[PDB]
Design a protein around this ligand. Sequence first.
Ligand SMILES: [Mg+2]
Ligand SMILES: [Zn+2]
Ligand SMILES: [Zn+2]
Ligand SMILES: [Zn+2]
Lengths: 263, 49, 196, 168, 43, 159, 133, 65, 85, 114, 141, 559
Amino acid sequence: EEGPQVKIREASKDNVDFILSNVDLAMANSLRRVMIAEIPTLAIDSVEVETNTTVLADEFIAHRLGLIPLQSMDIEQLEYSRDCFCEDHCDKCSVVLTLQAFGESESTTNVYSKDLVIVSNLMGRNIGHPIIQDKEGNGVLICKLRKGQELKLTCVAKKGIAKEHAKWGPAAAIEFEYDPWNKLKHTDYWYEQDSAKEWPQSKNCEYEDPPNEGDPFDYKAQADTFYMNVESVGSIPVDQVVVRGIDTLQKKVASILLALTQM
Amino acid sequence: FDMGGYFIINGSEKVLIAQERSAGNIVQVFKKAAPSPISHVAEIRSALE
Amino acid sequence: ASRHGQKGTIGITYRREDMPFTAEGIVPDLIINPHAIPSRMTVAHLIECLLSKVAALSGNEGDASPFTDITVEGISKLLREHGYQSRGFEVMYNGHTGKKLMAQIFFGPTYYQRLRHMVDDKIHARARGPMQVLTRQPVEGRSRDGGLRFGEMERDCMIAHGAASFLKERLMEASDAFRVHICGICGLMTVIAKLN
Amino acid sequence: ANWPLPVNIRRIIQNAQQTFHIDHTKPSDLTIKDIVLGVKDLQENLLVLRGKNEIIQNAQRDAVTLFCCLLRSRLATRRVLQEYRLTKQAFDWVLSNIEAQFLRSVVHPGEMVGVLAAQSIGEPATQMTLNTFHFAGVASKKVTSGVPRLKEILNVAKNMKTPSLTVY
Amino acid sequence: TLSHLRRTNTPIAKPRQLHNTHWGLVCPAETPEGQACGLVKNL
Amino acid sequence: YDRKVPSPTGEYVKEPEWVLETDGVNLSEVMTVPGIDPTRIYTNSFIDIMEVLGIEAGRAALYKEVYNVIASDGSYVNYRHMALLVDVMTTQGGLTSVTRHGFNRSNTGALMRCSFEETVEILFEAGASAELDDCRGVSENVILGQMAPIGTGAFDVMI
Amino acid sequence: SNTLFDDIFQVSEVDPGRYNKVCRIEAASTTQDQCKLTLDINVELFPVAAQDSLTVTIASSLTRSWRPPQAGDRSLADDYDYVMYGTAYKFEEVSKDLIAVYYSFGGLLMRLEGNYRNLNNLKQENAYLLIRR
Amino acid sequence: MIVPVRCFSCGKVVGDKWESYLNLLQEDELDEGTALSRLGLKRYCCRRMILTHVDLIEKFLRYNP
Amino acid sequence: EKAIPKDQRATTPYMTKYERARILGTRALQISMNAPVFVDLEGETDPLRIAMKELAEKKIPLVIRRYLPDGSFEDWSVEELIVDL
Amino acid sequence: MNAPDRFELFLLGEGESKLKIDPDTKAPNAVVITFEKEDHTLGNLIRAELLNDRKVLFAAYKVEHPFFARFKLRIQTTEGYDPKDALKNACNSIINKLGALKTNFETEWNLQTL
Amino acid sequence: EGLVEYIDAEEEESILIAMQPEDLEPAEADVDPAKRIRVSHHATTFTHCEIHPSMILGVAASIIPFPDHNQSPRNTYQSAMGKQAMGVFLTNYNVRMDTMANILYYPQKPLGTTRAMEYLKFRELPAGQNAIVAIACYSGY
Amino acid sequence: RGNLMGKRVDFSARTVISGDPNLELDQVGVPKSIAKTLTYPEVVTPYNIDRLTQLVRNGPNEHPGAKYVIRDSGDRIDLRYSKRAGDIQLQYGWKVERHIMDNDPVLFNRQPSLHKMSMMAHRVKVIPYSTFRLNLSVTSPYNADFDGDEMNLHVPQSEETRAELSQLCAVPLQIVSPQSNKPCMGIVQDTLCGIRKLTLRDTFIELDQVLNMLYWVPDWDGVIPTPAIIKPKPLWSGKQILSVAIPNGIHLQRFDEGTTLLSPKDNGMLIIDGQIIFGVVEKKTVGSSNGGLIHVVTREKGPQVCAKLFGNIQKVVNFWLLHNGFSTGIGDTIADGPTMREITETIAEAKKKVLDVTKEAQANLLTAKHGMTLRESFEDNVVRFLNEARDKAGRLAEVNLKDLNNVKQMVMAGSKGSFINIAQMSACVGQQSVEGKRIAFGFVDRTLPHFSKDDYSPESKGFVENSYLRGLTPQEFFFHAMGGREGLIDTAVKTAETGYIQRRLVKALEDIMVHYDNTTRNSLGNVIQFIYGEDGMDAAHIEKQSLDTIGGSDAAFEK
RNA sequence: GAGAGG
DNA sequence: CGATCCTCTCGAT
Ligand SMILES: [Mg+2]
Ligand SMILES: [Zn+2]
Ligand SMILES: [Zn+2]
Ligand SMILES: [Zn+2]
């Protein structure tokens, strides 16, 4: 089908290794940035501390709380509180989580992301459930407690983008390479005796034909074939990090087209 | 991990700084500078520890 | 600062997407300038980085102890064995653009220290405020909403510029300035100011 | 030969060459009189002082001596004609540019030169690195330098560390 | 803290210089810039 | 010593010369030794050049001295700045130091001298000698919070 | 305008000299005994070897904001392989009848020596260099 | 003082991996580098996160209050 | 007493940087204080830009009194003083 | 303390507008477009597409200061061709490319196993 | 058992110290070009031997990685700043009422250490983080 | 001194400084909180009444606002507390103490103020964040860096006081300094480095980037220059695009060593009508240099145009470099296996020279020259051999470094580092000195208790054979630390001593000024000079020019 | 007063 | 009777 082309090399719940051909580098990169910064997610944006006899500071705990990945599957059915007509927050624009933990045992008591309890009405939307990729099913150690120790708090998880705070990135590293053979001459290699001998060969070199020494420089050539690998934090499935990345970018171009109309 | 070696004076943690001085009872000869009438001087700063 | 007498302040902050990137998608937490290197001759810094990259890659602690037989050649062997160009150089792509940078960047971990001395504990501004009792001149220090000293040395630069009015304004309208009553005969501040 | 003087004649010449689009193929429209008298009259217009008296006229004559040397060397008939290849148009423009830039170059009464001088000497002295001179090779090169010397000079030290005669 | 607890002070011919005899006794590096340079030492 | 000297064809030529370098000074006596060039004899003891040759040669030697300190550091300062210093140290016919002994004891305003050093004692002798201060100096105007006759205030503005 | 100069040259030397894309060419005309040419060429865009026979032309037309090729129907004075644009910066007379012209094509220098350049090689911001075969 | 959630550089969740790492070291008697790799900490930014972490919380939990 | 007549003036026919600054400053102060403006401001509002215009069109009605070191002075009008700089 | 809110990166302020079209003073048929609360993501992508248009004579973007989200885009077009129309087609071309990609990735993804 | 012994500067004057046990006294009868140049025995009348030359350094300088590869004043500079670096000054911070305390949220032990750091309790109470650093000309900020 | 000559003042502010590639030379970045504390007393005139009403309406907490309204009688209305703070119908003749706004003249300063250039006037630019931002090319007069430095800002409170700052103190007015009759500001760091890299004959640009680079120049005519290359692809050279930043009617000619109008090495400099003809752009052209671009552009175009030239060059170069990259790593200090072998042998031959001379001295064969001791003669010889060795080893290293070497690259541009640095990092650190002599015998007849008595060998008296790359031995380490310390001790002295000199100089010449008769006089009316500088010329309007009649042969002069 | 910052 | 500038913080009388 028509323009840009995709070829999936590897795929799992956590990653997609794919080849993006018949595309401009401006597009490949704009797409790359959108997956990092602009795909909406759900994360803890407010913590009310009832009890903290823990060894860690309120704001230190509150910080890590925001860093816990939360289900963001059905995120477009949730409003940004700023657009929501409620006073403050509500089920149309937020998810409410509860955290009550006490040191019952003489041995150390660990507090996990599995211990947050959804207290608001999710209205059948797949949202707010802490992401657990742990084998023991605990996921994310928030805190540790001693005997008399207690932590009682309430969380308001809201919709947002990494551009506002990194906690909202469905993100994780985006492996990105083009022209593994430097045929384009986009980089001048630093060497001592031999750049070829001194620079390790890219795994992507198998997927491309070597330049061949008896050939003059291809001055007219342009980059089109981007070897990418998108890693997912958990909040959104990999296919979605890319699909919503495409969708978001498409959307923000449409807002320009609509802006031209308005004036 | 506290190492001690300091005092607690009115809740304040005080450190006595090691004071460098010349050792006493040491004979030391010095060439006195050109305009001086005394060519050289042998000195001993006799102390009682 | 790094552990090599390489102190500096934050000029700007950039989010991950603006930052230059590795093809494995690794991004720096810090970008330091090449110019901070040649004159300072702080080679241990560059060796620390090379060693630390091998250490994180291999799950070992680097031995950065002084008088040893640990060499840059030795570390470089181990770094290459990890599939990285032996001198810590890495191909990087521009964050704004996605296009490869012509130059390969020396990149890897380096122990940095967060020093005290933070802007917010230093910013100070005064547009009129508390005056000292004796001199009737601004108070001293940020903590007391004090005025900055416009010392002799500064007085000197205003003379060199020939700014006669600015120099008068600093020493009068800002700071003190008082109206005294003088006798035409003795020329002393004797006059019993009986205003109104 | 290279000395700091006002008015960069070379630059002015270069500017006339571009402004008037001088062709190094055609002969000039100038006269020996145009060049010789031109340069001569220009000299009577380089004012530093203005009083109609002899003390002042000779002081004026004196101040402008070295600049008039530079000017004469650069605006001699063969140079103007063979080297620069100026026209009457370009020549007259150069003559007026020198006068205008010379008059601009004069110090303004009100200039606080004491403080200027002090800071102009003082500032570099702060940047004076090493009290011990870099003459580490030969042991007979041991003359006081840097900040210790600058102090000997300024305090007019009767008892200097390195008194020395240089005999020709 | 450790540094402060192993610090030296010298009140008032060439005292600021790292003397030969300091080897193994006082640190060659650790001394304050400007002010008490070579007068404040560390074991 | 290296020496740039004009050749018989016009150009400057390097013509090396044997030069004697001394430890200690006796200008008056050495200059009369036969075999030397009493025209070229020099000393870094500008006080002696002053005593033997006069204030003007003292001044020229004082510039050479100040110049050399600046130049040894590889730095360059314009002639006029060091000339002004040297002239100021010179105008009295002798060598006046840039010290409380030198310039600060001169005929200047009491309020300007006290601003430097020996503050109180300058002010005590001012009262005792019953001195008058012009208030023509920068310092007295800074003390008075008045526009000094410097650049901007070095002239009056009228209608 | 039209052509100002046109000739065939035999390349003697090709020197890289610390550059990777650029080479300074040393060449003499195949027709005129006195006719010399020294020139900086982009060997990445147009490779040159020793003893190569190249046709060289100095023309002045085929001025305002440069418009992208847009070859749609755009026809230029190029039946050539390599074309530059530069500034006439010097006209050195190497005695009697010998004249040399200096041209900088964005800092890629050129020195053409001969005699017959006369009523053709003007001191222009103009000059297109056109090389073929 | 407790495992950071997420690697500072890339954002990979690391806060769920600490206990598993200690076990890999102790129970399985593996080396730090293979322990890190078994956890799926492939890049060096994620590797420094865990290997370099100092768990002072254990020390803090020792204080009786 | 003292004064030099117009005929016999020996100081620069040129305005000094110090004269121009003080002139522009004084006039700026006047304009800033609702004083009348001697030139047509063309959308101009800043007192200084206005004084600069009044200076450029020689409509500043001020006189510079140039003191010589003996105490004698030379009165020069802003009108007559040449503005090179 | 003097830090702006992070929403100021992507949220328009009261008074601010997305696009602000100014006619260029230096050249005929040229226009300058200020894009508020947008960075390199939109700027690079748009500038690149405008160069793909044969009636586009100039296309460049710049982000004058990193502190502020805004960028400026300069377009010069062929006599007869309006810069706003050039920006329009560039946008639709991007949207049609993005649409094509979404489907192509979705197609590929469905063939996968894991 | 008299295997080790205490020496002051006065006694230091009467003795001959080898710098390394091995690398100063085995026997004589190829080289690594990468390795630094070491002179030799050239004196073999030793009475003593250094426990370890890195012991010539005090607390602060003992934190520097490879100070033998740095221009000396930089080591003096680092010595000053190490005292201005926040970490975990004491484990009981939460219990004390100090006038001012600065604690790092996530102190990290350095990837590059010194053998002396074991005794200085550095990896136990660290004052820094292993930032991924790029040495580059980026935006010019 | 503390109360009259100097005093604490109101309308002053202070903070940590930061650089800003995107700030004009004459600008200063003011943190919003500071702009909000500091005020200007503006009189209500019909020309501002609308703006003042709005500012009073914004009040003290929203930026373009104000705190205090002063009316007749002189009563201050506190805009943060007044119940009528939202009322206020301004009247002409009232004053509004408005917040500091964009373009206001402010006095910016870095202590110590050794210069008049240490205290200059800038245009306010209100910005987020808590630091003062400044243009990189203003760093030098202030002697500023961003390793924790703080600077001070002073606010003029009078129309004439603002005129004084804008017309006498302004940054552009200070570009060319009277101190050394040359610019005190020039292109530095990244810009100096990238301007070289951009200027290489090899450096070519494609349409896409060119267009972006052109637009990055605010003074751009809108005209795309015709590309240097028109063949398989239009390709512009770096020299070409950088010439857009250079205004017209700018002529510059240089000639370095082998410069020949055909400039083989691309050295020297030739700029005609603001178009660079040949010559790699570096420190000699674009630095604080005597007859460079900056000294020329100020004199030719003017101070305002010259200050734009800073930004214009910064904008193009910073952008091109942002896209090119520039680094430095451990690999840049490494020389060839063969170079190292040659360095190693260079040192061993120096080691033998010292042995032979020693053996000779010990045989009573060494004769001392008139005026110096046999031992002084020996020490002088040994040190020369040892310095020669470091220099020879270093030159060996420098030569081996490729043009792609990042350290070599920074040295070529003149942005950071010199020969020594290459030599000490790559080849050999060399001899350590204390009090101008090699390491002294602090122990009886030895430097360290690891040596035997009466050992005058290089290693024994402080010769660092190794490079910072190879690493120093404990003996070498200690001796280097000894040499190092002497530096910090005099740094500490050659600051308090020079500060006292500076004061004395300033106090003694304070009152000397140029009078209306071109005379140089003190406060007493006493003559110092009859004509200032003997020529009555301002030092900033003077430059080194050749006196053509003095040199050459009598035949050359005639011709 | 000491400790520090450039 | 001199002995850099300015800036900060702390504790104690
Ligand atoms: Mg600094
Ligand atoms: Zn809601
Ligand atoms: Zn009276
Ligand atoms: Zn990571």
